[PDB]
Amino acid sequence: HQPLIARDGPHPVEQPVHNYMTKVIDRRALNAAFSLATEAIALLTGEAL
C-alpha cells in the first residue's frame, strides 16, 4: 500500500491505488544414494546362513 505526497499548482492531482501480485511455486525434486549386490542379498537373509 503506497503513500504519496500532495502536489501544488499546475501538476495534475494524484490518487492512491494499490498492488496485489500473485506468484506460483516451482517444483524441484532430487534423487540419490543407494545400491546393493547379489552376494549380500543371499547372505543378509534366509539363503546363505
Added chain:
Amino acid sequence: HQPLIARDGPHPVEQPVHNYMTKVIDRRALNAAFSLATEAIALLTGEAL
C-alpha cells in the same frame, strides 16, 4: 569411504562408492663399524700386565 550429494534433474543418479587400496612397506638397512686397535685389545683382554 566417500560422501554423496543428492543431484537433481537431467543427470545420472549419484551412487555410493568405496575404494580399497593396498600399499606395501619397504625394507632398508644402516651400518657403522668401529675397528678396534690391535695391541690395545690385548691390553684390555688381560695377559699383557
